[PDB]
Every structure is written in C-alpha cells, then in structure tokens.
C-alpha cells in the first residue's frame with residue numbers, strides 16, 4: 001500500500017487503507033485536516049466517484 005498524495009508507503013501506522021479498494025492515504029497528507037485514524041469506514045476519492 002502507497003499514499004495517493006505523496007506516493008510513499010512509510011509510517012504505516014499513519015496510513016489509512018480504503019474500505020472500497022486497495023488504495024491508501026497518510027492522515028497527515030489528507031486535506032481537510034485529519035488528526036487521527038477514524039473509527040468507522042473510510043473511502044478514497046476514486047471510490048467516492050462511484051457512489052450514487
């Protein structure tokens with residue numbers, strides 16, 4: 001798994017994994033600000049584009 005924004009896979013305890021696909025994102029690369037790893041489901045922007 002690699003971060004969509006910065007393209008690195010380091011600091012994996014900070015690295016969110018998408019519940020709809022194999023993609024990821026560091027909480028510190030997310031905008032708007034994300035202080036912590038959320039408890040519930042997280043969907044990347046590519047999965048959001050499939051919603052209705």
Ligand SMILES: [Zn+2]
Pocket residue numbers: 003004005006007008025026029
């Ligand atoms: Zn990143």
Ligand SMILES: [Zn+2]
Pocket residue numbers: 018019020021022023043044045046047048
């Ligand atoms: Zn996704």
